[PDB]
């Protein structure tokens, strides 16, 4: 989303033209930022915070996959496994900071819906074991064995 | 109104716990008067 001041924000409107142009200019700024991000070649965007409606709309317009990760541990692990740097602002990423994954898709395993960042090489920083089972307790025991 | 095959106040204990408890009880009874043996024994007040 469009970053705001950390002190306090107050849209000071003094003329009718400012009132009629504020929202339009804000939307145009969001569109420009999203298009700038997309023009680098990025096609998957992962954010640690909330997703604004206008930002989501403009990401959908430019065919960009959006994944939101609440935990910062997950964000750092994703950066490790993909090779990307967590940008602090919404600037487009430079060539060194854009991580690459050989396949990202939405899938359903059993009942739960999952998002998979899948490589094809037999390497990488992080490897994941998907544990199946008929009971939560059984999977917990298998996880203890894996540990 | 429980079924109560046995009476409500009936308690059952079985297994290794029973044997350990019996042997520990005997050991405790022995330890009560362990020191009251021999010419140099000490008296007790009851």
């Amino acid at each position: 989303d469009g970053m705001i001041t950390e002190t306090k924000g107050t849209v000071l409107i003094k003329t009718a033209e400012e009132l009629m142009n504020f929202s339009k200019g804000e939307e145009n700024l969001m569109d420009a930022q999203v298009k700038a991000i997309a023009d680098t070649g990025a096609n998957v965007v992962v954010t640690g915070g909330k997703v604004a409606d206008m930002a989501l709309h403009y990401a959908n317009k430019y065919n960009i996959m959006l994944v939101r990760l609440n935990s910062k541990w997950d964000l750092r692990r994703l950066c490790k496994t993909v090779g990307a740097t967590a940008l602090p602002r919404l600037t487009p990423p430079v060539l060194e900071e854009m991580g690459h994954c050989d396949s990202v898709y939405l899938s359903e395993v059993g009942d739960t819906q999952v998002v998979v960042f899948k490589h094809e090489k037999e390497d990488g920083a992080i490897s994941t074991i998907v544990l199946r089972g008929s009971t939560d307790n059984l999977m917990d025991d298998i996880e203890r064995a894996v540990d | 109104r429980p079924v109560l095959v046995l009476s409500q106040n009936t308690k059952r204990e079985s297994g290794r716990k029973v044997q350990s408890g019996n042997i520990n009880a005997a050991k405790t009874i022995a330890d009560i008067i362990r020191t009251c043996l021999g010419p140099k024994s000490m008296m007790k007040m009851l």
Binding site: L19 | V3, V5, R12
Partner: protein, 535 residues
């Protein structure tokens, strides 16, 4: 057999499986079915005395002490404070019949009770309940096909409302408004026919406003081809009657404009104060002059207004009414043919509605005034103004008129009718019995039980009318078999004839089909339950 299971293990150590298992209950097997059948039979037998023209009302009292004297089955069961789950299923069945059809909400309960009562004796002979449900479904299919076969079609034209009037009269015959029977049927038919899409499309009940007010007599209930508003002219000195009124519908309060956004207007000098005062005065004068320029004779607002606007409206011979509700604004706009204008600057002559007469109505020694808008050109909205001697008959008249409107709506959807008075049920029972003879023996019992259950409606009508149930039903069935006439029913009103076609006892085919279908499905659902686990 109750409370579930209790063993505490064969080794004496505790054996607890379900939380609070010692505080819960469990019914299993056949006795659960018997309890459910007994509860449903109790509900149906309570309801069956209110079936037919000679039905008797039930006086329902809620938790607050308010009294509701009514004959509608769905209302009675809705206000009934039940704890048994099967009784709740009966209540939901009545609500379903009311929602889908609007009439016959009492017949479904009696039919379901009869079906479960027969299923009881079928179960006592060792028949699996699923077999009973399957036989009931088969017999219901046969009965529905027979209803389609013996159905009759009526004309739903606006130039001949006699069959529609007869159907509405049949619907209203069991209600307290049977004193004004023909007038009630007339107004219901006219209301439905006025607001309806003629290509057999839907009837929007939001375009029918049912309004009640105490006083007067029940015969004073009338259909008004306009809108009756619970408001009055804002200024007490405004004229109480406007004729050929050019109506301006507005949703902007007659006040100085106010931005929605957080706004502060700064007054920094005496000249600023004078300019602000002049701006206020000029906005008031300008809005009134803009209303006047369109040629309007009457203004309706939704959000009220203040003293300056009130006196300006009075000074310019512009009668006005304020604080009219949103739905009433919509109804007035629809009836008068005028659009809804959100602000004065957008108000033009072509957006004005037209009403042949706008009047303020008093109600005796009550100080209450209610506005009337009528004599519209081609009004597509109606209002039923119900009078009476007490609030209770007013509510009962409201629901009876709703039943009549629903029946005419069903006729609009499908114009096939079946003669009532128990004739349809008797013919269906005969058809089911005939089809049961060809059936293999095992489902024959279920089909015969279904026919016997269908026989309950004429028996209930006979006992409510004081006649002997079994003798009358047997004679009518014999006459139906002897001569090909599926219109012979129970002479509840003692008119001297058993033919419901001359008696003009008319029921919609959709209503009977829905009754049979819903009763069969609920009976199957209850028959399929064999376990109860209340806390």
């Amino acid at each position: 057999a109750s409370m579930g299971t209790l063993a505490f293990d064969e080794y004496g150590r505790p054996f607890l499986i379900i939380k609070d298992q010692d505080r819960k209950s469990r019914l299993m097997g056949l006795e659960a079915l018997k309890s459910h059948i007994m509860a449903a039979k109790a509900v149906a037998n309570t309801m069956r005395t209110s079936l037919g023209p000679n039905g008797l009302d039930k006086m329902m009292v809620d938790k607050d002490g308010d009294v509701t004297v009514t004959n509608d089955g769905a209302t009675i069961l809705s206000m009934m404070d039940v704890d048994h789950q099967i009784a709740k299923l009966m209540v939901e069945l009545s609500k379903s019949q009311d929602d889908e059809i609007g009439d016959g909400t009492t017949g479904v309960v009696v039919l379901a009770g009869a079906l479960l009562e027969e299923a009881e004796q079928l179960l006592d002979r060792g028949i699996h309940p699923i077999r009973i449900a399957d036989g009931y479904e088969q017999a219901a299919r046969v009965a529905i096909e027979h209803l389609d076969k013996i159905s009759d079609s009526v004309l739903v034209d606006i130039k001949d409302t006699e069959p529609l009037i007869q159907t509405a009269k049949t619907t209203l015959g069991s209600k307290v408004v049977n004193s004004c029977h023909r007038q009630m049927a007339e107004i219901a038919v006219n209301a439905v026919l006025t607001v309806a899409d003629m290509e057999r499309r839907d009837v929007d009940f939001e375009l029918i406003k049912v309004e009640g007010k105490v006083g007067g007599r029940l015969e004073d209930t009338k259909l008004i081809k306009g809108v009756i508003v619970d408001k009055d002219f804002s200024h007490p000195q405004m004229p109480k009657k406007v004729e050929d009124a050019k109506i301006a519908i507005l949703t902007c309060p007659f006040e100085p404009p106010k931005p929605k956004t957080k706004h502060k207007l700064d007054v920094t000098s005496v000249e600023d104060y004078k300019a602000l005062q002049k701006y206020e005065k000029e906005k008031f004068e300008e809005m009134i002059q803009q209303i006047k320029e369109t040629g309007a004779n009457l203004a309706i607002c939704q959000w009220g207004f203040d003293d300056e606007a009130n006196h300006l409206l009075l000074q310019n011979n512009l009668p006005a009414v304020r604080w009219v509700g949103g739905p009433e604004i919509e109804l007035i706009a629809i009836a008068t043919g005028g659009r809804i204008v959100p602000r004065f600057s957008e108000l033009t002559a072509e957006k004005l509605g037209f009403a042949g007469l706008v009047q303020e109505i008093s109600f005796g020694t009550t100080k209450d005034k209610m506005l009337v808008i009528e004599q519209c050109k081609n009004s597509r909205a109606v209002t039923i103004f119900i009078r009476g001697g007490n609030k209770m008959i007013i509510e009962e008249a409201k629901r009876s008129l709703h039943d009549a409107l629903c029946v005419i709506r069903n006729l609009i959807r499908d114009n096939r009718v079946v003669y009532g008075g128990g004739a349809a049920e008797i013919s269906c029972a005969l058809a089911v019995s005939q089809e049961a003879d060809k059936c293999p023996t095992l489902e024959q019992y279920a089909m015969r039980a279904f026919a016997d259950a269908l026989e309950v409606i004429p028996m209930a009508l006979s006992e409510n009318s004081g006649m002997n149930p079994i003798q009358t039903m047997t004679e009518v069935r014999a006459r139906q078999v002897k001569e090909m006439n599926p219109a012979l029913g129970i002479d509840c009103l003692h008119k001297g004839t058993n033919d419901m076609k001359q008696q003009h006892v008319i029921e919609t085919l959709i209503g009977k089909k829905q009754q049979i279908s819903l009763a069969t499905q609920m009976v199957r659902m209850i028959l399929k339950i064999d376990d109860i686990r209340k806390p």
